[PDB]
Design a protein around this ligand. Sequence first.
Ligand SMILES: [Cl-]
Ligand SMILES: [Cl-]
Ligand SMILES: [Cl-]
Ligand SMILES: [Cl-]
Length: 498
Amino acid sequence: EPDIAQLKGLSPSQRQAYAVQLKNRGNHFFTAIKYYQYAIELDPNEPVFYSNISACYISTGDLEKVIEFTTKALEIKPDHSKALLRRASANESLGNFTDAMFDLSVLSLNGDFDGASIEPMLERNLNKQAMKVLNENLSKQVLPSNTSLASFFGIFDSHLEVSSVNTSSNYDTAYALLSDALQRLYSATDEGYLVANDLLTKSTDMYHSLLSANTVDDPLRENAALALCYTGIFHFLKNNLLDAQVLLQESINLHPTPNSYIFLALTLADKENSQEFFKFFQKAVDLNPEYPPTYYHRGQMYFILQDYKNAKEDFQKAQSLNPENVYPYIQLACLLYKQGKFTESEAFFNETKLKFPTLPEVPTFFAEILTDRGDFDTAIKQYDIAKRLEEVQEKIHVGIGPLIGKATILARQSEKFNAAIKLLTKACELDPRSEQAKIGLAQLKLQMEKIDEAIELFEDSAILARTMDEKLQATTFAEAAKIQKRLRADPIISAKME
Ligand SMILES: [Cl-]
Ligand SMILES: [Cl-]
Ligand SMILES: [Cl-]
Ligand SMILES: [Cl-]
């Protein structure tokens, strides 16, 4: 109704004075947008007009307009508390979680606001942003670390496995390759795992071809089942659960074996419903009640489930079937510890050490328990002993586990900080597929303000991580650090961060 174009043609002072009057009218209509817009048309240099309009759009629910006009207020007064809080809210609603965390971060730098009163919204936006990025990445061929692989295959009898290839077929022209793949697998070396993965795939292809012919042997079917079994579990280790189940069932259909059932159970495992897991292991036991790895793997599930009695019996059975394998001893000692029986656990570890004096598995798992007890001094010494034993072994036993355990004690103890960096850097070099090593190193990079390097280690770690929870954890660290990068990139912000 007032003629704004006409008022626009008046002197700056008149326009400024008329604009206050227009804004005043707007404030009344508060009982509005039209009058604030009029005010802005006349004097675009008053943040009050923009902040007032943005309050209108909150009322009307126009989120995009709230962003537009809070931003206009903030261009003039970048620490306008009301505008920062409104823009963060609208941004959170629109799914712009990074922009919400940036404005909430700037807000906290205002000493008028208790950091603790803003942290819950920073945290909520961070978790939303991590889940957004994780889901995007999931929506749009790498092995676990050599340390993890040595651990996974540690229970099996290397010589038994390699010898399980049948040389009596009249049709099997492929078995030398399967024999080679298993020899390389059970070498427990860096080269071994890489080689095993490619050679098991190639073997499986060759068996798929031989099985397609009109003439096939039982010895042949058994070798094909064995290739499929190990290729299946490699799929599982590569986080390809679907192709894992397919090949493992193919294997079982050809020639049911304990390993085939153990590997299938592992692939489909879920502690929150256990029934199928235990049926698969009972069938594995049926196929060979004297096979130690069946009982050991079932004991681990009972352990996870806190069925300590059944876990003890299964580990004892694995132990009695193959007393020369250190793993059932370790788990028995760990079982004692988790039941609050540290003194018995410690005695069991000491007896195990006498039986296996050169194996770093013993001090490594014992150091883990001491760390859990807060006995950081003694844990360091046990990690030191494990590290020295590991370095001199021919095979991988505990891999970089000791370097990680020691660095982690040193890093949070706090001089030693450089010692922690050197340990974790060595660990990353020795076992480049270890997400544990990358994440530990990234945490220290953050503390010395190498944020770009942190981000890269975190993101690489999420791609490496196997479980959804571990992928989400590493994504969360990456997304948090990207916010840090963004804040540090503004020198005014960065000075206030000091
Ligand atoms: Cl007028
Ligand atoms: Cl204005
Ligand atoms: Cl999350
Ligand atoms: Cl080590």
